[PDB]
Amino acid sequence: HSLQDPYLNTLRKERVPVSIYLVNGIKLQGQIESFDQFVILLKNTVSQMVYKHAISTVVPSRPV
Amino acid sequence: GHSLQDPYLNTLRKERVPVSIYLVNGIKLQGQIESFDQFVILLKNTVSQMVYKHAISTVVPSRPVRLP
Amino acid sequence: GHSLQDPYLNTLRKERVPVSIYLVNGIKLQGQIESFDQFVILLKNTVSQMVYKHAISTVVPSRPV
Amino acid sequence: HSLQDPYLNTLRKERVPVSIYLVNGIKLQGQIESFDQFVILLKNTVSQMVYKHAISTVVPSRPVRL
Amino acid sequence: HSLQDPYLNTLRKERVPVSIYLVNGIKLQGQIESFDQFVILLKNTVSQMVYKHAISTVVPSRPVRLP
Amino acid sequence: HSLQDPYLNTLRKERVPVSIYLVNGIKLQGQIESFDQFVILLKNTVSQMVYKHAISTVVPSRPVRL
Amino acid sequence: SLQDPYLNTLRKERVPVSIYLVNGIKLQGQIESFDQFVILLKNTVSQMVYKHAISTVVPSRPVRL
Amino acid sequence: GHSLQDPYLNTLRKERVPVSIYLVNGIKLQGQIESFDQFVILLKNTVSQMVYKHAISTVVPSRPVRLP
Amino acid sequence: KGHSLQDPYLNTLRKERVPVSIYLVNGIKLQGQIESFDQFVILLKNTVSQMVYKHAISTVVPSRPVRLP
Amino acid sequence: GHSLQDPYLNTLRKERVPVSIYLVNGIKLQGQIESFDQFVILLKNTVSQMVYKHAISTVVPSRPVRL
Amino acid sequence: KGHSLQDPYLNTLRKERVPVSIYLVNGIKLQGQIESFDQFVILLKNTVSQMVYKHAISTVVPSRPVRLP
Amino acid sequence: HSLQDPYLNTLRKERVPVSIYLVNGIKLQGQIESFDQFVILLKNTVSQMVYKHAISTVVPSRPVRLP
Amino acid sequence: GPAMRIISVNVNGIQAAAERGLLSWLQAQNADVICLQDTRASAFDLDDPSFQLDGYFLYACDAELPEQGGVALYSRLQPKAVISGLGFETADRYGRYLQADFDKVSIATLLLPSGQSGDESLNQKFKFMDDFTHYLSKQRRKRREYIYCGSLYVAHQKMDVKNWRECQQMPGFLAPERAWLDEVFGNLGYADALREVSREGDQFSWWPDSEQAEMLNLGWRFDYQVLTPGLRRFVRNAKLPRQPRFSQHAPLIVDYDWQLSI
Amino acid sequence: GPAMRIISVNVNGIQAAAERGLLSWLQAQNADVICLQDTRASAFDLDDPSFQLDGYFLYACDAELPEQGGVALYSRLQPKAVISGLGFETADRYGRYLQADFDKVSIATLLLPSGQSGDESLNQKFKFMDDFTHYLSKQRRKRREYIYCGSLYVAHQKMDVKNWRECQQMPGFLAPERAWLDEVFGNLGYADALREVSREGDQFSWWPDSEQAEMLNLGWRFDYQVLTPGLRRFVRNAKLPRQPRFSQHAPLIVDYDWQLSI
Amino acid sequence: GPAMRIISVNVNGIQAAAERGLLSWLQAQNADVICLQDTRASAFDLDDPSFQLDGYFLYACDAELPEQGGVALYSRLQPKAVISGLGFETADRYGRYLQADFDKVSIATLLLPSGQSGDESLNQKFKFMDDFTHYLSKQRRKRREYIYCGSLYVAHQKMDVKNWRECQQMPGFLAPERAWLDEVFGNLGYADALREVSREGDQFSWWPDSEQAEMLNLGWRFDYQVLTPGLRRFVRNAKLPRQPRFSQHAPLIVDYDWQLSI
RNA sequence: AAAAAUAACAACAAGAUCCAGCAGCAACGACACCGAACUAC
């Protein structure tokens, strides 16, 4: 709570490219246009709604 | 409790966009969202397929859609 | 929170549709749904086997319902 | 749990050698000694504790009624 | 917890070299140092910590009888 | 979470170079900068957010206790 | 209104009944008579049960009126 | 009204039959019915306790009694 | 005067034969289908003809949505 | 009706005998009945109270009392 | 049955559609809005039309205060 | 009647913080906002309607005298 | 002293036992409650004063057909209340259950179908067992100590039957019946009265009609006194006198230090 | 910090204590609730403002006869409830028990008969003891955390009295009395605060009328703080000021962590 | 049949046992193994052939202070190996333990200090018990079953002591000892030998030196054949003969169906 | 958000630091991890 929501808010307000590595091993590219408690939107080339449980890690493209 | 999944799914349903669901296993399914819920999603194909939420990884619409 | 799962599963079980339950690990189970719960389901392809919900991925009905 | 609890209890009281297929493919064999909301006990020379969130299926070696 | 804690605390008190098989098929060895509701600790040279959502099974080396 | 919170806090304060092994197999390296319900911010030159539901184990590397 | 014919029938045919009071306990027996507030239940002993304290009255066998 | 309650209560009172009353709470008082009206009953026990009708559930007599 | 809203609701529940619950004050979970309701009694029709008093009921939860006339 | 409740409570109030009122929940109040009335009884004790009739189950006079 | 407080309060809670919480004698807590009430029944709305009896209700607390006539 | 109405009117006018104990044994708190022949509105950050047929008793936190 | 004796004697027809002298033997044999089962007669038949003993009450519950089943019960003092219902089609329709209540102690005359008559009887027995285990699991909440005078038609362990090697196939000793009886005496916590005081073999309570098994003592223990763990400590002694047998089963006499009361 | 104090002064007649200036000693001793035992006077006598300490309430229940018994109780604030009697003829008719409930706690004053006067006194003592242990067993499952700060006139262990071998035949240390007290304590799970805070010997409260006995310290510990095991964790300390010895008993004072409130 | 008779006895000094004639009586009684607790003699003293019986071997562990303690043990056949140790300081110093291994069965001559002498003895006993609980928690893993023929000097239940109301404070029966015994015989699962073969009272094994207690039958049960749950089923008979008294205690012969062998 | 129901508590001053040891596992779940999505163990 004290970390996830502020971190996602900072990632969104900065429009930084965010690489979301899923638990399956795929590297999804794009920016977090918005985020929810269960799904995160990663839009850059095509709309996407990556579910939270299927997200292993989320690395920014530059310092935040 | 969520406020972004329900409207997104309702839009993908009413606009009847060719949706592609990629599961955590690493496969692909194609079809339109006929109905959604807190734990299941019906996908239209040769035979309606009930995909569970906990198994879905990504839901990509074949065309860009705008939020309400 | 099951307004869509419970009716579908109940219809598939009553109508005795040979469904195929694709799990998360990629295995393709088969058999008719005997009785479903909130966290477990029962199949009878050869014997009464209990499949856990959290391990299920999709349920393809062999006949359109 | 209207089916999980009675099913597990019937498999326990009768001491039916059940085969529990986990998620990663490997299968364990043995009778159910005791079970909980998140743990089952397999007796097959070593009383091991399998986790509910890791089990995929549970097939009895012989048919069982309900 | 009616049957989970009575087993983990027993293993802890008895110091049984338990083998934990995770969900991804990887095996770990060691004694339970201090189990919790979410994470368990191992008593190896590094004192690894394994979450209770990635553990598939926990098999003891010696048969443990529930008290 | 009686011991998880203090353990992670001790690993954070001391800036211990932990090694977080996920469930899929890949391992990440870096000191724990902060943690919260279903999230750990691993910061070591580059920042990353690893979800706990996807983490399998956390080897502290150095002998560190609560 | 229906209580009067119901109890009259349960008393005529001498059907074994089971009363369930508010507190939740069950009393098996056989109705002997009924009034506006009291009912005589006989099963080895004859006891007077009060209407306001009764919750349900299940006949042991199917009965209509 | 009470065409069957009084013929029984006064009968138990006259013969001084030891009866056990069962309050609505679930416990059980014991003793002989000393006096009773349309609202309350009195137990002849040493304490001379008074019980309220609406709080009573059943009145089991220690011995069978004939209905007048 | 005392059943302006209870009488039609119970009559509709009985006509539609919708699964009713009829919770008691004790908190027990009854069920069945109301066959006929009077001033102080409700005859639930289930596996066996049952009679439940009004003063011991605490809730009437129909399983399906019903509309009052 | 209510032909016996009046004299009993009247005497219990006149003699000021300490009575114990047992309610329907099983709780027990203790003190002197200061004033009896329909649908309500007034208790007397440290931090007096107003007990309702429909909630009372029994009234034990503790000490012997006659009607 | 001659009261001058319950009727206006319930009518205000109904017309305003305020989230109400009903605690029964048994101690069970129901939550929802009122559809229609009478001297012996109250129709609560919360995914179902729940006819809760009057005598089985102990307290009724609204989520926010309301004005009286 | 003779004792309920004056007592309740005094408790309301004086605004005594009373505690209403229900039939189940639960304890409530607040000042008597209003009373009626069947219900009572008790205020304490929220006006709750408590039914008279579910009130075991009322304990005034301050001594009160009848009129 | 505060002794309490209970006699459970299956008669396979009260007529034969009364002809052999069970009535007089019981009237002479001091006891408190006789759990005699398998009456095979209607209530109007038991009402005959010929069966009614002196100083002992009579209660009986029969099925739709008098010979289809039915169970009766005697008692020294008038029980607090008697109930002739269990809630199962396999119990009420056959009149196989009747319970009498004294001060926080309930005695029940349980009667399970033999099953040797055919496959349908075995299926009915299995259904009755599967329902009775659930009934027991539901009754664990009550605080009253129960004394089930059961004719389970099932042997628990090896000592309960001679030449088990040959009986492993005959009904009354199969695997599911054994598992059910062990679960009753196992997880559920109940304990048998006879096996508590005398942990020795050869104490059988049934023999086939052929006198060969009787001469060789080849018999089973189809009679049990199931006691709630609360009453397990009050078991003073148990006996299975075989000589004064009035039917295929033998009278099972259990004495406790408990003192019942109206 | 959070601290509460309780005092126990068996005045053995409030008149004698007041004659020795005990009122001023109690007034100086800051306490939340004072439980003096054995008033030997009616409630009308205690109503005298002389015994009423400023800032402390006055409650008292008198026996059928003044000198026979009677108990009193003082509270710094108005208690939520005050009750007397236990249904027993040995308590109600003598007012030897007076309870006061505040919130989350209930402090009681108890006076058991010395039993040293005659044989009838010891018989009544046995009766009161058995009835009181019955009542307390009936009170174990309750929610109220009772503290029966009372005089039992019975020594529990040898640590409460020297030369116990000689006191074996003397009342207060008799085998049945010690057994009853040990059953009230351990079997039911109750404990004492004074021993809990310090398991030290040579600490007594009662002393015979002989002066040399007090000179050589020959006393018994009869006043106890029978305290439910729930609140035993909040006990701080306990003292036994043997300097005054104004009366036969001593001012057993105990301070706890819990704080009472209206 | 395979009757293994174990005879456990506390000689309270081998000198007194030899004087009263324990050797002859023990040799007369057919038994596979005999445990002698509290020898009060050094190993060299036991070397005398007077104590060596025909057909039996001589094993013994002597305390550091010979008079403080010491244990012995004879068996009919050469055991696999003798383990004259335990691990704790008290055991190693006072030689209060000696073990003999056999086929899947091992007999231990345990001896807990009586604690009847003084306070230091009671403290040593408490320490020995708080260590033996750990020891038994450790031995709970190995496969071989154990038979501790030990004089625990602690009575378990009321059946082991008459007039328990009086002995509620005598050493060997206080609350902590009772709790420790109940935990060792319940939580750990080490079922007793007497409470499983004969659930009757008056089975005393200890008697004070005062002849009054002997005449009145006032005695305590201190000897114990502690059995691993694996051996509980192998119990048959166990009776305590008091007429052949050779020390403060009395023998405790117990016959088992298990048969030992090298 | 409700025990398809306690034949019934002489009664809750009151709940919203090492196995005296198996005639022995055709072999340990193949060893503590070795960083753009493809549907039978």
Author numbering:
A (entry chain C): 5 to 68
B (entry chain D), H (entry chain R): 4 to 71
C (entry chain E): 4 to 68
D (entry chain F), F (entry chain x): 5 to 70
E (entry chain w), L (entry chain J): 5 to 71
G (entry chain P): 6 to 70
I (entry chain N), K (entry chain L): 3 to 71
J (entry chain T): 4 to 70
What did the article's authors report about this structure?
The widely occurring bacterial RNA chaperone Hfq is a key factor in the post‐transcriptional control of hundreds of genes in Pseudomonas aeruginosa. Here, we describe cryo‐EM structures of higher order assemblies formed by Hfq and its partner protein Crc on control regions of different P. aeruginosa target mRNAs. Our results show that these assemblies have mRNA‐specific quaternary architectures resulting from the combination of multivalent protein–protein interfaces and recognition of patterns in the RNA sequence. The structural polymorphism of these ribonucleoprotein assemblies enables selective translational repression of many different target mRNAs.
The structure of the 3:1:4 Hfq:amiE 105:Crc complex was solved at 3.6 Å resolution. Schematic and cryo‐EM map of the amiE 105 translation repression complex where two Hfq hexamers (Hfq1 and 3) enclose four Crc molecules (Crc1–4) and a third Hfq hexamer (Hfq2). The amiE 105 fragment threads through the complex, engaged by all three Hfq hexamers and all four Crc molecules. The final complex fully masks the amiE 105 5′‐end and is proposed to inhibit translation initiation. amiE 105 is presented by three Hfq hexamers and adopts complete or partial ARN motif engagement on each distal side. For the Hfq–amiE 105–Crc assembly, the downstream amiE xARN motif in the proximal coding region only partially occupies the Hfq distal side yet still recruits 2 Crc molecules (Crc1 and 4; Hfq1 in Figs EV3A and 4A and B, left panels). In the Hfq–amiE 105–Crc assembly, the second amiE xARN motif in the amiE coding region is partially shared between the distal faces of Hfq1 and Hfq2, with nucleobases occupying alternating R‐site pockets on both distal sides (and EV3A). The proximal side of Hfq2 coordinates an amiE105 hairpin‐loop structure (hairpin1). Lys3 on the proximal helix of a Hfq 2 protomer is likely to form a polar contact with the RNA backbone in the duplex.
